[PDB]
Design a protein around this nucleic acid. Structure first.
Ligand SMILES: [Mg+2]
Ligand SMILES: [Mg+2]
Ligand SMILES: [Mg+2]
Ligand SMILES: [Mg+2]
Ligand SMILES: [Mg+2]
Ligand SMILES: [Mg+2]
Ligand SMILES: [Mg+2]
Ligand SMILES: [Mg+2]
Lengths: 158, 117, 176, 43, 387, 220, 322, 101
RNA sequence: GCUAAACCUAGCCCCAAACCCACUCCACCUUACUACCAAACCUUAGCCAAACCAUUUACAUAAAGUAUAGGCGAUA
RNA sequence: CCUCCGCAUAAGCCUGCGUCAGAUCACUGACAAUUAACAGCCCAAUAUCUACAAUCAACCAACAAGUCAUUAUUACCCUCACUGUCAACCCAACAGGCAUGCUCAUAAGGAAAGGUUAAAAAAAGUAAAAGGAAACAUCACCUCUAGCAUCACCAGUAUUAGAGGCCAGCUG
């Protein structure tokens, strides 16, 4: 979203211009997720996929800032949780293919405690953390029973 | 033309005045032909005791002493209500002593309330 | 009968009636729940008696015989109701551990502010409740500016109050 | 000067709380009245 | 060309959030919260069913789980059915021959002047004037008010002759009586569900009209079949039905035998009001229906030719116009197109008054005009049948 | 705005439908078409322009009967209530169509031409070339979009393999497939053109306010 | 605007009030194959007729009891036509309106721009009997015109508004069941049935079990005064030209199961304060208590079938003009 | 009771019961002539006709036969020194006709 | 000598310091203050100055109004 | 003596000539009231039905084409709650306006005159000798554009749709 001078001299009308990229519905095959996605993509993205030698590398290599898609970051969390768990659900009844795919991307091993939080927005992480530490409160009956059996076991040792 | 006045039921056209009521609670529901069915169970029954031979008048005599306010905490109610049964059955399954984990089977559930007042 | 809306017919026009104390709370914590139920109806009928006597007092343009015992009966109904709520609360903390009798949640309405939302009872679950889903419990970003403006209005009122307190203190030290 | 020809349906439908909250602009109307400190935010 | 534009149709939900496509991960939705939030994902709710049962929120099973969903479509004939081809279609569905004019057996009841209410012109003039003018507080009564009151008061005039004939003390007129009768016709099953005013019950059945020479003479008659109209137009194609034969009554009922069906057309609007040919068709199907149910109550569900044939007559009206019908049901083997046929005598367009002046014109006084009492002679002939 | 179109009924119905005037306004309540609005009220009779439709569990050609030739407020031609088998439907009337007339809705494309009567509907392969037709489709199964107003007619000019060429009343020729159904004869209510409105009352009663060769086209 | 007197009324003790409005003395009392046909109608409506749609309890007295009473009247006017030829030529109106409009008393306007002015307080009864029988000739009076009777008419000591009685303004009608051009202006008998509100089951559930029979009695006085009174207006009498002969009609009113019988003898149309000065005369309403026609109906037949109730129906249908 | 959330009734549920009644009542003297059976009361706004019947039946053992209620508008026309309207509170009135004569 | 006149103290302003608020009960996005049924982001523009207006036109200290930019002008 | 006004409902207003008391051409405070039958407030699904105007409706007469309807199966048993009800009133003006039903001079509602004098000028009314004036829209027509379907045109289809143009008499 910018402006131009009308015939590339500053002494003409300053009038505003939008430069839109060229979009292409293409289709990809993530080997780690093992799925064909239909993704709208640009020519520069196809070029970066070629330079990374695959969409799994393109997603696991590119930084969150640089990639700049929520969907690409969700693919990244999907692949990283698939690598962080060494999931048998990649290719069931084909363990050699699983171990080959998992050893191809051994470079990006992240622990599972970190791979869940990858690419969450701040509100979505607020939600996930809200569901972690939500609990039904403990009925004070049980707390008072614990304290009183503690006290009667202090009196038992007297 | 007033904004300051409270919007009450006395105030609109006919269609407005019919809908809005005061704070009273619905007892049944409307049916076809605008025929109100009253449901017996939605009407509150005033459970009222028998006051015969009852020794408490509305006032207390001024000759009664002064005491100290001790609000009933759950520690106290646990102590007197539960603590003898645990002391007896410990010197010799928590549901034995008047505890209930759930209360979905219960008529007077404590959270959320179903009783009134 | 209807004669329970009026007191003893000997007391009519006596302009002073000896009534005792109110119930304090600690006197009432010694009574059973059946006994507090019955005392509730004793005080209830007494309260209706005194309210008819007030309204007839204003009607006949006269003063009340003794307006104090209305204050005492409201005092006792308040104490009794508070005791019963104490026992409900303590039992609720033991059996469930909740603190409110009624559920709710901290939400955040269209106006950006954080509100304790008290839940209501419904029959259908919330996702297909057509009227519940018209309420917005989120604030869009055009609200945050007004949140900041409200924040600063509160800060100005607080600053003015605190400063004004210090000025009054200086006047007290000049006067004494 | 009989320009105001009253009805309560037009008044609540034009300027009530629900029409005010129906749009973002109207929510900002309420917020300005709430910030000026007004006793009536709407009809 | 399909009907119903897209703007009035159920709007499609927006397409799912892309997180539901990624195989590994659970999405984070606003279902943890209990309200919409636009920066979380829209969750997918399980199909909720109300556990208990409440009548004002009942949602009935689809049209297969109904315990009588017969695949073979039954065409039903209720009282509202306005037929297309008029009388010919009811003659086909009924398997009957038509005979214009009432028989001499019925009209000969009022041959002598002894079967007459005294001053029948004055009395019928007072019934017309009462219902059509003097009846209610309104200046003109609508057809809704005048129609059943005209029919009702004419039946009271004919009821006043218990003095001359004791036998009329053995007939009542019931209302809100709903009969039903199913029969097969060539290929597909038919049913009449009869819900009309004033079925006049008797203890005694009506004596038959047609001799066996005429019943036998119906064999050489052919039903005038028609085309392109498949002869089940404007009936109600129902799949969810029950084959049943109802006389309208429990068994062991005094006054069990239908005499006259007084069916009327009391709708205020000309669009609503039945056309007189369709009125006649409705009478043929109702008299056929009640007579047929009488045959199934007396003789089982046996497709045969009846030895005691049943006769049920009916009077239908718009208010000022009368249509008489005598129906002679003598076979129950309906499905073939041959053998003996039922036979019916009609009176078409027997108006008893051309017009009624409720307000005087300025010239013509208040009252009816074009009064012709031969039609009440026909009415009173039908009331005195079997007495 | 709260514009919900009345054009909302899903099932075909023989009854008139209460329809709502637009007033020339959009769905956004702004006048897009000047000089509409404020007529006498009308109800809409749903016309079946798919002239050959076999009914449920039927196929092939089928006869139908005209019950009533009815004036229609929603258009210039008058219409016919026409019943066949177990269904009535409103079709659009040809010039000589009486009550009681029988009309064959045909599908079979004959080897020879079909000497059709005045008001029946045939695929364009089954017509003598150089006859007046009306209610012409554009696709097999499209429904009859053209040659539809009062007294109008178009002549089947010539046909090639699986293709007929029509002359519309604007004399622009149209290339349609062979197996598209068109009805023969000219549309009814002739001398709808030859008429004097006389006063502006009738201008206002029809919902009207005051105000402020091409190439032979194909569908193959 | 005028009070709007409902005969079939929920109001407590509406009887005593209607004797005030009406100027009536209520005196208690009165001045074979029929059993077969009656039980045929009872069993016809409860048992023998097959209902398509299920008859709910609220829907009952609209569906069940109304054609029962219709069939009773039509069949008894059938069978009793030889014994009483006046019923052979008598009109039989089903659910046909009777209106009467009269003025009774004076009220000074308590508030507003018309305050302190004499405004006489008008009343209207709009009624629909279930079915009424009207004869062209008039029944003989029961008691003589200007019959003294020592029991006194009630006097209410508050505004009639206090009996939940409300005012409206609408068309003042005086109507007997048909317009004045009809030759059958006089009235024989009138059959009412109490609506679903006034069931004695509810009146026992609410503590007004006393008012049960009162309901019957109120429907007696309001309806018949509105009928006889209206008849008196069709013969030209009104409040200043009072009736020179007593007008008489007759009403069996019911709950569908319990019947009560009433006679009414209108002696005065002079109800206004101008016309109640030299007016010793008053209207008299004779009445019975309610008695059940049958007791129960099981599967097949009736049980506990009273016969005196049919005899009082018949004795109502059997009297004659002269 | 008043100012309490009532528990929701579902079809086949228990009876709604109130143990300590929240709302008081006062019987006033009528300002106009009233029938001898009638008794006038000032119900609080939320109390229905049915609640008043069961209220007098349960607590006071009065055989009530009819109840009729009207809501009375208190004036909003009287002002402060600040030209601000004071509202006299609206109140509900019950007319109770006693049974058994 | 009438009308009047006088009056200090409510409070406020500018700093500093310090990071604020918000469920007695009940009701409150439906016609808010009503007990209870099948979807957010997308360049601010212009005034004005240039004595018109058309590109343009401001939104700790010190280097420094320096380098720079600019109808190489206003100015930045 | 007026009455072209009334009385009700609607919309609107919200206690605004009820009682007690007091201050002020000659409102404040207290208390009390409007009681439901009238009117609002409705409706279990899923399918499937709804060609024949109204007009005293009879024909007759038409065009601008019209304000009104169910059936099939399933589920269904409790019942009279809630709200409106007052007034001399509203929108204006510092003249006017107002929907509907009845009454069509009233059974209902009201008062043109503070007292006087009887100047001018001004307003209104009556009488007066003799004379008797001293452009746009649009039927219809023409032109141009447009071969077509699910938000107007239009649920229309070139006979269509859209845009254009056109003397005697009387009298202050
Ligand atoms: Mg009220
Ligand atoms: Mg400048
Ligand atoms: Mg009513
Ligand atoms: Mg009023
Ligand atoms: Mg007057
Ligand atoms: Mg003067
Ligand atoms: Mg002048
Ligand atoms: Mg002159």
């Amino acid at each position: 979203l910018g402006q131009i001078y009308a015939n590339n001299d500053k002494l003409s009308k300053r009038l505003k211009k939008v430069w839109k990229p060229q979009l292409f519905e293409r289709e990809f095959y993530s080997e780690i997720l093992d799925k064909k996605f239909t993704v709208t993509v640009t020519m520069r993205t196809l070029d970066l996929i070629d330079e990374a030698y695959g969409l799994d590398f393109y997603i696991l290599k590119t930084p969150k800032e640089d990639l700049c898609s929520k969907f690409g970051m969700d693919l990244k969390r999907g692949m990283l949780l698939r690598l962080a768990r060494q999931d048998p659900q990649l290719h069931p009844e084909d363990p050699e293919r699983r171990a080959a795919i998992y050893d191809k991307y051994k470079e990006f091993a992240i622990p599972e405690e970190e791979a869940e939080w990858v690419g969450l927005t701040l509100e979505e992480a607020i939600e996930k953390q809200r569901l972690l530490e939500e609990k039904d409160p403990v009925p004070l009956f049980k707390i008072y029973v614990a304290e009183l059996i503690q006290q009667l076991q202090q009196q038992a040792l007297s | 033309a007033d904004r300051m006045s409270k919007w009450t039921s006395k105030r609109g056209p006919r269609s407005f005045r019919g809908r809005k009521g005061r704070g009273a609670k619905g007892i049944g529901f409307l049916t076809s032909g605008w025929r109100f069915v009253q449901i017996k169970e939605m009407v509150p029954e005033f459970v009222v005791p028998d006051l015969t031979g009852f020794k408490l008048k509305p006032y207390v005599s001024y000759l009664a002493p002064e005491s100290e306010e001790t609000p009933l905490t759950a520690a106290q109610l646990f102590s007197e209500a539960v603590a003898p049964a645990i002391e007896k059955d410990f010197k010799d399954n928590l549901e034995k002593y008047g505890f209930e984990p759930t209360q979905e089977g219960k008529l007077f559930q404590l959270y959320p309330r179903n009783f009134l007042r | 009968g209807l004669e329970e809306f009026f007191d003893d017919p000997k007391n009519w026009g006596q302009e002073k009636v000896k009534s005792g104390a109110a119930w304090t709370c600690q006197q009432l914590r010694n009574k059973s729940n059946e006994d507090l139920h019955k005392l509730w109806y004793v005080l209830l009928k007494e309260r209706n008696m005194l309210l008819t006597l007030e309204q007839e007092a204003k009607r006949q343009r006269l003063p009340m015989p003794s307006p104090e015992r209305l204050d005492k009966v409201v005092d006792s109904m308040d104490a009794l109701d508070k005791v019963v709520q104490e026992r409900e609360d303590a039992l609720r903390l033991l059996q469930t551990g909740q603190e409110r009798a009624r559920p709710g949640a901290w939400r955040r309405d269209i106006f950006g502010r954080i509100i304790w939302h008290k839940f209501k009872q419904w029959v259908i679950p919330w996702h297909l409740n057509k009227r519940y889903n018209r309420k917005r419990f989120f604030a869009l970003p055009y609200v945050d500016h007004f949140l900041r403006l409200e924040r600063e209005k509160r800060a100005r009122i607080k600053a003015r109050k605190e400063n004004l307190e210090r000025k009054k203190a200086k006047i007290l030290l000049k006067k004494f | 000067g009989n320009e105001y020809q009253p009805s309560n349906i037009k008044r609540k439908n034009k300027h009530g709380w629900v029409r005010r909250l129906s749009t973002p602009a109207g929510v900002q109307v309420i917020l300005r009245r709430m910030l000026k400190g007004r006793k009536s935010l709407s009809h | 060309y399909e009907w119903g534009v897209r703007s009035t149709r159920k709007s499609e939900p927006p397409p799912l959030d892309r997180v539901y496509e990624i195989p590994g991960l659970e999405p984070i939705t606003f279902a943890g919260k209990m309200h919409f939030v636009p920066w979380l994902a829209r969750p997918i709710f399980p199909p909720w069913d109300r556990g208990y049962k409440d009548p004002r929120f009942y949602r009935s099973p689809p049209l297969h789980e109904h315990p009588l969903y017969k695949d073979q479509a039954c065409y039903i004939f209720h009282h509202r059915c306005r037929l297309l081809e008029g009388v010919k279609q009811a003659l086909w569905l009924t398997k009957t021959k038509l005979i214009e004019g009432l028989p001499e057996k019925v009209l000969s009841l009022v041959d002598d002047p002894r079967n007459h209410i005294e001053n029948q012109d004055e009395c019928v003039l007072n019934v017309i004037s009462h219902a059509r003018l003097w009846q209610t507080t309104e200046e003109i009564p609508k057809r809704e008010t005048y129609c059943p009151v005209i029919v009702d008061n004419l039946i009271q005039l004919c009821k006043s002759q218990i003095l001359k004939h004791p036998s009329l003390a053995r007939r009542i007129c019931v209302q809100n009586s709903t009969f039903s009768a199913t029969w097969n016709r060539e290929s597909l099953l038919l049913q009449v569900r009869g819900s009309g005013g004033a079925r006049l019950s008797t203890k005694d059945p009506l004596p038959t009209i047609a001799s066996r020479e005429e019943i036998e003479a119906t064999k050489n008659h052919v039903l005038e079949t028609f085309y392109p109209i498949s002869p089940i137009i404007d009936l109600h194609e129902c799949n969810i039905y029950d084959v049943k034969n109802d006389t309208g009554f429990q068994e062991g009922y005094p006054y069990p035998y239908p005499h006259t069906l007084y069916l009327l057309d009391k709708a205020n609007l000309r669009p609503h009001r039945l056309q007189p040919d369709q009125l006649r068709a409705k009478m043929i199907l109702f008299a056929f229906g009640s007579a047929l149910a009488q045959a199934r109550l007396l003789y089982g569900n046996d497709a045969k030719v009846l030895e005691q044939p049943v006769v049920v007559q009916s009077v239908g009206t718009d208010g000022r116009v009368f249509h008489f019908l005598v129906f002679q049901l003598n076979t129950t083997d309906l499905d073939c197109n041959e053998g003996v046929k039922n036979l019916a005598w009609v009176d078409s367009d027997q108006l008893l008054y051309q017009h009624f002046w409720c307000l005087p014109v300025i010239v013509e006084p208040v009252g009816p005009v074009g009064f012709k009492p031969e039609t009440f002679r026909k009415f009173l002939a039908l009331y005195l049948h079997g007495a | 705005a709260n514009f919900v179109s009345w054009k909302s009924r899903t099932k075909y119905t023989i009854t008139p439908v209460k329809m709502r005037k637009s007033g020339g306004r959009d769905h956004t309540g702004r006048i897009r078409v000047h000089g509409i609005g404020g007529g006498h009220k009308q109800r809409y009779r749903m016309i079946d322009f798919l002239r050959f439709r076999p009914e449920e569990t039927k196929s092939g050609p089928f006869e139908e009967k005209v019950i009533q030739v009815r004036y229609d407020p929603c258009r210039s031609a008058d219409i016919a209530l026409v019943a066949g088998g177990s269904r009535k439907r409103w079709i659009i009337a040809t010039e000589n169509m009486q009550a009681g007339d029988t009309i064959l809705n045909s599908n079979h494309i004959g080897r020879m031409a079909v000497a059709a009567r005045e008001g029946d509907a045939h695929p364009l392969g089954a017509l003598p070339v150089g006859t007046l037709i009306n209610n012409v489709e554009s696709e097999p199964g499209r429904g009859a979009q053209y040659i539809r107003a009062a007294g109008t007619c178009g002549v089947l000019l010539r046909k090639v393999n699986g293709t007929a060429i029509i002359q519309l009343p604007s004399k622009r020729q149209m290339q349609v497939l062979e197996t598209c159904v068109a009805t023969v004869g000219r549309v009814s209510n002739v001398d709808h053109n030859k008429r004097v409105i006389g006063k502006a009352g009738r201008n206002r009663w029809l919902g009207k306010r005051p105000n402020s060769l091409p190439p032979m086209k194909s569908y193959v | 605007m005028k009070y709007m007197v409902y005969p079939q009324t929920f109001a407590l003790n509406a009887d005593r009030w209607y004797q005030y409005f009406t100027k009536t003395v209520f005196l208690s009392g009165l001045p074979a194959a029929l059993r077969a046909v009656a039980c045929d109608c009872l069993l016809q409506e409860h048992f023998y007729l097959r209902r398509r749609r299920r008859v709910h309890r609220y829907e009952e007295s609209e569906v069940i009891s109304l054609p029962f009473l219709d069939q009773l009247v039509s069949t008894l006017v059938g069978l009793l036509s030889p014994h009483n030829p006046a019923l052979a030529a008598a009109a039989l109106d089903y659910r046909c309106p009777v209106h009467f409009y009269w003025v009774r008393g004076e009220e000074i306007i308590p508030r507003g721009h018309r305050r302190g002015r004499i405004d006489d307080l008008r009343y209207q009864i709009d009624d629909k009997p279930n079915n009424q029988i009207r004869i062209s000739k008039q029944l003989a009076e029961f008691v003589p015109l200007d019959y003294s009777v020592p029991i006194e008419i009630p006097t209410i000591k508050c505004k009639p508004d206090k009996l939940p009685l409300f005012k409206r303004q609408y068309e003042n009608h005086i109507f007997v069941g048909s317009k004045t051009a009809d030759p059958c202006c006089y009235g024989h008998t009138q059959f009412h049935l109490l609506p679903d509100k006034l069931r004695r089951e509810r009146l026992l559930r609410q503590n007004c079990a006393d008012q049960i029979e009162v309901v019957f009695r109120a429907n007696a006085i309001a309806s018949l005064f509105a009928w006889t009174g209206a008849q008196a207006m069709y013969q030209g009498f009104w409040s200043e030209a009072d009736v020179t002969r007593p007008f008489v009609s007759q009403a069996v009113i019911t709950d569908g199961k319990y019947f009560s019988f009433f006679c009414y003898q209108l002696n005065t149309l002079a109800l206004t304060t101008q016309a109640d000065q030299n007016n010793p005369r008053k209207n008299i309403c004779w009445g019975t208590q309610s008695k059940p026609l049958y007791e129960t109906i099981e599967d097949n037949d009736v049980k506990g079938f009273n016969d005196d109730v049919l005899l009082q129906i018949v004795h109502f249908l059997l009297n004659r003009p002269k | 009771a008043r100012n309490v959330v009532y528990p929701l009734y579902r079809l086949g549920g228990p009876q709604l019961r109130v143990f300590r009644t929240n709302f008081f009542i006062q019987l006033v003297r009528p300002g106009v002539a009233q029938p001898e059976d009638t008794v006038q009361f000032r119900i609080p706004m939320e109390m229905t006709r049915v609640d008043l019947r069961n209220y007098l039946e349960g607590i006071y053992n009065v055989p009530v036969a009819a109840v009729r209620t009207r809501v009375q508008h208190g004036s909003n026309k009287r002002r402060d020194h600040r030209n601000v309207r004071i509202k006299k509170p609206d109140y509900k009135v019950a007319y109770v006709q006693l049974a058994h004569g």
